[PDB]
Amino acid sequence: AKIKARDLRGKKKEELLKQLDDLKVELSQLRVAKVTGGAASKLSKIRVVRKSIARVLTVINQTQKENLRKFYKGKKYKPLDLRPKKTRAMRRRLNKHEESLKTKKQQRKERLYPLRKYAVKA
Amino acid sequence: TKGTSSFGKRRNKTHTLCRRCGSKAYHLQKSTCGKCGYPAKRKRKYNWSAKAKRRNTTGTGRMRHLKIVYRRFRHGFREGTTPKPK
Amino acid sequence: KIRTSPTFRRPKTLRLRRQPKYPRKSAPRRNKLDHYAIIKFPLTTESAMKKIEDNNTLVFIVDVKANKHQIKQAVKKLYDIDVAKVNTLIRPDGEKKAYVRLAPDYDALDVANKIGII
Amino acid sequence: VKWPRYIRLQRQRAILYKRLKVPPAINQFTQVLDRQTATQLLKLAHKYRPETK
Amino acid sequence: PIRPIVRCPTVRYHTKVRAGRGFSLEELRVAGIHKKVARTIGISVDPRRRNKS
Amino acid sequence: GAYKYIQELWRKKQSDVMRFLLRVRCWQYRQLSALHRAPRPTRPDKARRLGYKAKQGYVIYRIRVRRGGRKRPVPKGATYGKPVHHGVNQLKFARSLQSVAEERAGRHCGALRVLNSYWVGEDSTYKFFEVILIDPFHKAIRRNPDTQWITKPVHKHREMRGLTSAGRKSRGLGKGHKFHHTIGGSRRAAWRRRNTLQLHRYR
Amino acid sequence: SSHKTFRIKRFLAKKQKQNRPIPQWIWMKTGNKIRYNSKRRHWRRTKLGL
RNA sequence: UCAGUCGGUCCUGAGAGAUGGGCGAGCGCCGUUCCGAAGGGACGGGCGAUGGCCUCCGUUGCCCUCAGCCGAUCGAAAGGG
RNA sequence: CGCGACCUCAGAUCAGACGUGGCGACCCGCUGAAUUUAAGCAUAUUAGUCAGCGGAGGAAAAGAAACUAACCAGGAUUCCCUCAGUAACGGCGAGUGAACAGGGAAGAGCCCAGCGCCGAAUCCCCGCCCCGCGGCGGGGCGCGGGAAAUGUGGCGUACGGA
Ligand SMILES: [Mg+2]
Ligand SMILES: [Mg+2]
Ligand SMILES: [Mg+2]
Ligand SMILES: [Mg+2]
Ligand SMILES: [Mg+2]
Ligand SMILES: [Mg+2]
Ligand SMILES: [Mg+2]
Ligand SMILES: [Mg+2]
Ligand SMILES: [Mg+2]
Ligand SMILES: [Mg+2]
Ligand SMILES: [Mg+2]
Ligand SMILES: [Mg+2]
Ligand SMILES: [Mg+2]
Ligand SMILES: [Mg+2]
Ligand SMILES: [Mg+2]
Ligand SMILES: [Mg+2]
Ligand SMILES: [Mg+2]
Ligand SMILES: [Mg+2]
Ligand SMILES: [Mg+2]
Ligand SMILES: [Mg+2]
Ligand SMILES: [Mg+2]
Ligand SMILES: [Mg+2]
Ligand SMILES: [Mg+2]
Ligand SMILES: [Mg+2]
Ligand SMILES: [Zn+2]
């Protein structure tokens, strides 16, 4: 019937592949029917099959990339596609740890002379 | 024979379509583009033709990635987070 | 050791190969040009049908990025039919029309009427 | 042999040192300690080597 | 912060008193206030001011 | 301290001891190319007082600049205008040759940033400068708070904006009665501020 | 010219496919003001450039 | 509008154009062998590893030895092919 | 002859990073005219302006005196009013033309080299273990590698310091 992604994620890879190829076969024969000239049912079903193929590929890719980043979750060097894709300037920006590093000179300066909380009577 | 008869020898084009700017100005003999300067790594751009500059700017074409960056900015470029499922 | 040639050239040094600490791309890119997307749809023109009924061949419409070897292998895998030769041209509309001459054992009429085109 | 430019440079520099009138403040380093005294000094210096990491 | 009493330099305005940049180090040391704690408690300090009066 | 003796010696350039070193260095540098990297600075004390520290991430580039003035890049004559602007031969560039040296050194090494530059030798037709470059993306520099300021994008290409020691001299700025024509952002900023009509709402 | 290059032939292919008329079912839309295809090209009036 | 055999694709002509270098405030320019450590090749021999009936050979990894070229590269649907 | 260091220079599809280009209203550096005015025009004026080149940021630049003053003295930089169409420059012709002080907006100060004192007391990289990791960091174990004495780090900078 109407295939949806909720029950596709639990499916294993080989079953998804052996469903994807059947979707490809059905799309191909629907294309053949369109070229020959048939009823509008096949023409309408062409869009449904294409979207179903797209949804299956999306699920397969999401599971594959999720497993990849799960594998690279704890490692130090990770592939560029798995790295966070923010703006170039933000990536080149210093991190919070480096920008929070404070030299001993200003550390002891803040120690000896902290900013006080004061008030003046009218 | 300066005019109409001279016009009859137009049979070998000088420029071809540039592979960077897309306009038909890529000089073959010069091997350079008169519209954007394809061999030069810097896009041809002069301030004495404001109309020419405006015809091809950042906001002219599709903005395939920049308009995505614009809508990501309003959320601060979130990464790795998804809305809570039902 | 002594030098015979009066000219000096750079000595050949040892150079190693790539051993990255991480792959540049996490996974290899999926083959978007598979055996189903290489061929789009067979033609149903009267000229094509006259060709399949005489020369024992088939006509397909494919993308411009498909080689004759790729077309032959794709047809063989999709329809289990041996291919004698392939002749490809690019139509003025942009699509590539491929004539697939089958092996003498197979019959184009039977293949056509069992894949749908008739 | 047509030596590389760097080899040629580092050799003709020594040639220029031997050619030009080197001032005494610089040429004083050319006059150096003899071999037996040098190795005796190294033997003495080997006793007070600094500690490694 | 608090800024000191200051009179304008020129002859045109030597009869008027304005607000200063900060309290001088000599004034602070007479008052027994450290140069590093004065800013923390909210006292303007500039080390360039002299005291010829 | 050795550096005190070194700088005192370097201040006596006209003596024979330093003159021999200057000519030997000048000849050796002339034999080399126009732009090359020196593994260690020629003048340690001068580099240190310009900001160089002997740590990973700082490099020295010894660059050569053709000595002389600047003639107008026009055809043979052809100053098509009033006789005031006919000057071609006796024109002078508005920036020092040191500023030129550091700007092309920085242009060549686009990944690194210019800190300072100094003078290591000169000839009739060439003058030699050493330019100090910082690698902003080396962690030994980025993780050090007192020198991580150069890593910020604000200091991008200081030499081409005129922010180095040589560049600031050409701008003609500083406190004093001698620099009234540059108070504000710069000389051009001061002129722009002066040459405006501050038309108020109520006039 | 019979010795067309691949890029030029592809460019001509797109222009030919663009030259077809508007289908007759479109102008029945509600927010429609397209009475005809005004950007049609004829090989004797406009030479398409190149 | 269907090609191993028809052409392009290959080569180079007049020319054009990077690297080295030099110049230039600078986009860049000059220059084409000139102010260059310009060879990623190999008959053969030796060391070591693998596969196949480990015979003999192939792929290699390392070393010895030998080696000129003229300048990367582009440039003709009437030149060569 | 060879072996082993140091120094200068190469080759790397070597491991890990960075720059390339675009917009360019505002900003920084350089180059930079002629229209026009002077009732002509050559100095001037247009004008450090247009054009041209390079470089960024969310602002930029500047910036804490080799300062202003000559008074009973103020005290970083920047912007508004004022000084002022003044001093002054100008075929002293046309025209050009600031700054000080004063009132406000804002207001925040600092850090090295050098001289010295502390066993280089400093820093980087790779291997392993634990923790959170979609701003790759913290702790521990490596007679692991390296930078550095041709000078890293702590004290310390003209207001004195040790
Ligand atoms: Mg310190
Ligand atoms: Mg021509
Ligand atoms: Mg430009
Ligand atoms: Mg004039
Ligand atoms: Mg000067
Ligand atoms: Mg045949
Ligand atoms: Mg050229
Ligand atoms: Mg060719
Ligand atoms: Mg031919
Ligand atoms: Mg690598
Ligand atoms: Mg840029
Ligand atoms: Mg006039
Ligand atoms: Mg007039
Ligand atoms: Mg006139
Ligand atoms: Mg003037
Ligand atoms: Mg002027
Ligand atoms: Mg000027
Ligand atoms: Mg401009
Ligand atoms: Mg700034
Ligand atoms: Mg000071
Ligand atoms: Mg002021
Ligand atoms: Mg003026
Ligand atoms: Mg004032
Ligand atoms: Mg020190
Ligand atoms: Zn173009």
TrEMBL record, chain G:
GO biological-process terms attached to the record: translation
One GO cellular component term: cytosolic large ribosomal subunit
Transport in keyword set: no
Molecular function terms from GO: structural constituent of ribosome
Keyword Methyltransferase: no
Short name of any one Pfam family annotated for the protein: Ribosomal_L39
Keywords: Ribonucleoprotein, Ribosomal protein
Membership in a protein family: Belongs to the eukaryotic ribosomal protein eL39 family.
Function per UniProt: RNA-binding component of the large ribosomal subunit. The ribosome is a large ribonucleoprotein complex responsible for the synthesis of proteins in the cell.
Oligomeric form and interacting partners: Component of the large ribosomal subunit. Interacts with IMPACT.
Protein name (record): Large ribosomal subunit protein eL39
GN (gene name): LOC100343258
